[PDB]
Symmetry: D2
Subunit: 344 residues, 4 copies
């Protein structure tokens, strides 16, 4: 039996983890039990007040986020803002599996963490991107997992096959558009529907976004060159979805690149290379754990270009948390995680 | 090994049926296989060229909609425009399970079919609304099913308990808002995203809309009274969803009306009537076969109010279709049919 | 040269008064100047931090809302829609023209006010709905205006001609779909883009909505009979717009009804009657002071149907404010108000 | 009094042109008169059936697009489907001012035109982008105007000052998100409401887009060096808007770059630099002829970043046309083109 808690269940990330715990085959056959669901200000309320789409768990009472509530669980999902997984994992048994969606344990460079996040660095856990060279090995059987950010996921998948193959220059440029739900359920004026509907805006530009160094970190894991990352995230009128455009100087032929991408991904269950003439679209991956990827070559401009479409709440967080949890617990990697997206 | 065919596979209802089949527990242990996938002018093309979310069936070539093609399939789903299933049915073998998403076999009065469809009445098949009184027994083991339209499913599910209780009057009004997908994939110009985004409009008003008599028909099955229907559809900037507001004169206490809906729906797997103080929203049901329902009384205006939310492609078309296929084959009714919406 | 202040210049209604003044002919030829722009919080900040669409005023420094700062203005807009403003009005000299966007002074029945608001009734001022019978003559030269609510502008305009000609029954049904901008700038989670995008929901149903008596009041102004109102508001992924489906039982012919609406509107320059075979859509009036109206008869249901579309921040709020202000000052009524929408 | 004819009056470009003239001061006093409104297939329709938002022109009868009809007008706008306007162009009088929104007369290099347009090159007319250096001078008194593409307008105003100041390296990247209207009014199934809503997708990537050569061109006009452009457009669920993110390497301080954009843009009425700490957004410029630019520097990436927002129908097409018509006829450059957009 595997009893699972979720800290921050009243937020988007937590809702997305529960939808999938609901659909997990380990749930339907009882090898998985949904234990405690906690929050902060919303403790004492029913979950239907927050997640009216998770009707099976609507009667559940949101408990306070305390080590005393979260003890006695084999697995413990952390879907709260960064800074809390530090203290909170220090309070649980060593053998319980902790899956943190925050950024606390993502970066390996303490000085980068302080420059970008503005707090002390808690260290690093295995990185919940199984598709990354070497990462899958490190998830198998572990008990501490750090889920990647929603932007670094789309980009690394897009870029790492070419940079590891040495078919593109190590200075990359990423311009991603995201749906609103990647900002989180905290009520801020600038994420009101009246404001995002019919309006696009780029934010945190010129390399100040905290995901800039996360993409950098991962690409440096496939190369020995100096890596450079111009990241620019763009907010568009959508609830979910991440469409990441990724360019970098190349002199290799599209022949060689397309072959580079088939090798790295032909056996990946979740990565789907588009047929020629096709190009990813976010709307086709919504609600699925899949990533759609097209590669091309702008030879007039000696520019490689590669597009990834991922759902930011699944492959971008909760799907990667569940996928990492399948590996940590030794269950089939795809348990609970469909590749069939909900469309239109 | 139930071998299934889907005529009109490249349509919205066709892809939603296929999406659902791909997640059916029968497909997973092979008691179900996906067979011919047929269309009209898009025959010869691949399915991924139409449904990029259905990557497991993207390599499939869609064949023409011909008896030779459809034959030798135990179940055939027909997702064509009307005027086609009438002849396709005697052409197929009598023992195949035929399920028409269209309207050709929905209605039971020939004067009404002519008055609204301009063609000859085809007659009548069992109606795909298992929750309607007496429907389940008619579906168990039939081999011919007409699936309800999206709007009648909403209106009926919202009104009939209080009308079968004789607690409201039989002159109901329904104003249902709906996403764009119910209009289907045919490229009209007032369904272009530029004219749909940021605009709402009512169409087919004053009771010329073909769903009006279908609702009238469904409501007449639970009352001996003379029923009248004012029905108004209003298209809104959304890809999925149907919010149906239905009002009727009543002088019954709220308590008795509430009781009549709990008696009607407590044991119903896909019908979830909201806690007191919550109200349905479409986003809560999307991707899922649920209907979220709420009732209230406008004491001043002496008016009952029922609100209903259903996904227009799942519970209004393919979910009902698959739900009735489960019944016609004697499979657990909820198989492949989730009550958990994809939200936000 | 009339000085103009705007109390609550940072919210939506406030920003849309300024947009309209910015493009008002008196503002161009010096007759009109734009004085103090106050707010509760966010005072000390620039207006461009709030309305980056109003670049000309971007430098302006938002001030506190006090009788001090508001004193010394020929006209003062109280843009805290459906809030409170009675206290401010008593700290201003009676010679100052005050146009209140909120509902403090709309209602004519203290008992109804207390019942629906829980406050002491401030009393009543001329209703800013010029097309209403008798409304325009009470605005001419007035020093106190109450701008009507977004929904009752739509419903009154749709319904009163039929009602006044005694061609429909006084028990009416109105269902209105509306964009998120009517909820205001008030930060709240149920109004986040991720929430609103992709979903619809009726809220505040079955009599509880505060515009219900506002609709009753306007109708009782054109009939001596007792009027009930079933009003249902519905949220939709739009930022602006109000499409109101309004119904009442009738026995009068289509021709009698269509004539009544042309007798009432051929002179009114903001009401455009749809040609035979057309229907309102909100997309066609956005950013405009127009109301687009169509009428029909469901003969089977014995039901009148009227559809009206307006912009919820223009003809529904700021447009009514300015249109009435023009009249208050003896300026031409159409000054600065276009009937042409920015579409698609 | 200048008689004007719009050809393509039934399409998005056409109706936005007509919205502008209706608001034009030259229309209000009589120096401008709206004449024949023609379409390719819509002849015999009234204009309201196409543009319900231009109610003042609703009664106009759409005529066929033939030289006989278009003759007798001083100015003639050509909003004809993406090209094939050169025929019509030589069939009108040579003293008749024609503004072409198509692309047939934009390009300079016949070799580049054939490569991207598969057709023989018709020649080049003065580009209708006054902010481009030396461009305003060739528009004064012109009788041949080619309006820029929606995308080049953005990228050029985003990039040209820094390239002209020789501050950035002339290999530039552009990844622009855009609403659906820019694709025009032709009904594909890929522009269907259901499909663009909730989905992003890059299209025509890796240098196949016909705006890439138009971007290279304008940039070639401000520099000695050879310019290569990497242009990615991305469709988003919006109706109007373009948000162009443009990068290139730079070896300058942010200070020099801002000092170049202030130098270029302090005197141009429609180009709005953002206050330090503010970044552009599309919802702010919608319905106006404005363009909001901001520049930054990612020092660790040695990258210059310029963000530009414009309304794709106004500054991107129909506004540019009207603006260039003002210069053509010797009227003030801002006549009929506000800088204040319609938001939220
Ligand atoms: N959203 C995404 O797409 C995404 C992608 C990748 C990673 N993540 C990560 O997932 C985590 C959750 O973000 P979100 O998008 O879900 O935001 P959210 O919707 O607003 O919810 C965040 C959750 O954190 C809880 N919480 C806040 N402060 C807390 C505190 N002191 N103690 C305990 N619980 C607290 C909240 O409970 P209350 O209701 O009581 O406030 C809430 O349930 C973040 O760390 C994020 O980095 C998110
Ligand atoms: N979509 C909904 O929300 C919904 C809900 C409830 C019920 N329904 C019903 O489901 C049915 C399907 O409509 P839809 O929404 O899916 O619209 P749609 O997207 O246009 O689908 C139409 C499908 O039927 C095929 N088709 C068209 N004409 C054909 C012909 N002569 N012969 C054979 N195949 C033909 C088309 O193939 P080609 O590509 O070759 O043209 C296409 O695959 C309708 O009758 C509808 O009333 C729909
Ligand atoms: C707060 O602005 C937003 C809006 C949408 C978003 N989608 C994904 C993110 C990641 C992040 O910046 O945290 C994000 C941020
Ligand atoms: C015609 O535009 C629309 C928009 C949304 C819709 N949902 C369902 C339908 C068709 C119908 O079932 O009548 C429909 C049509
Ligand atoms: C969710 O709350 C909303 C949403 C949209 C709206 N449009 C107009 C209003 C006024 C009101 O309902 O009080 C409104 C309120
Ligand atoms: C072709 O699909 C699209 C979708 C959205 C668009 N917005 C602007 C354009 C102009 C262009 O690319 O020609 C466009 C095209």
């Amino acid at each position: 039996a595997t009893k699972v808690a979720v800290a921050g269940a009243s937020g988007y990330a937590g809702g997305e983890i529960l939808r999938l715990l609901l659909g997990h085959p380990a749930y339907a056959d009882g090898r998985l039990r949904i234990g405690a669901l906690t929050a902060a200000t919303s403790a004492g309320s029913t979950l239907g007040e927050h997640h009216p789409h998770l009707t099976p768990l609507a009667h559940r009472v949101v408990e306070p986020t305390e080590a005393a509530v979260l003890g006695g669980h084999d697995a413990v999902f952390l879907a709260l803002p960064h800074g809390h997984s530090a203290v909170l994992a220090q309070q649980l048994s060593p053998e319980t599996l902790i899956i943190d969606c925050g950024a606390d344990f993502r970066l390996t460079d303490a000085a980068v963490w302080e420059r970008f996040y503005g707090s002390s660095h808690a260290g690093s856990w295995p990185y919940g991107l199984p598709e990354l060279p070497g990462a899958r090995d490190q998830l198998r059987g572990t008990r501490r997992i750090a889920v990647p950010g929603c932007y670094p996921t789309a980009a690394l998948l897009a870029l790492f096959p070419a940079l590891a193959a040495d078919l593109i220059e190590p200075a990359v440029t990423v311009v991603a558009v995201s749906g609103t739900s990647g900002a989180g359920r905290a009520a801020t004026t600038d994420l009101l529907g009246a404001e995002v509907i019919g309006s696009a805006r780029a934010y945190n530009i010129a390399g100040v976004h905290r995901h800039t160094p996360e993409i950098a970190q991962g690409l440096r894991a496939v190369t020995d060159r100096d890596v450079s990352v111009s990241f620019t995230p763009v907010l568009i009128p959508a609830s979910r979805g991440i469409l990441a455009t990724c360019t970098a100087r190349t002199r290799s032929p599209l022949s060689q690149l397309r072959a580079a991408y088939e090798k790295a991904y032909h056996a990946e269950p979740f990565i789907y290379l588009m047929p020629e003439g096709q190009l990813p679209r976010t709307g086709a991956v919504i609600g699925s754990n899949a990533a759609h990827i097209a590669v091309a070559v702008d030879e007039d401009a000696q520019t490689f270009v590669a597009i990834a479409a991922i759902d930011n709440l699944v492959k971008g967080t909760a799907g990667a948390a569940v996928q990492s949890m399948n590996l940590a617990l030794g269950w089939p990697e795809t348990d609970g995680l469909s590749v069939v997206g909900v469309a239109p």
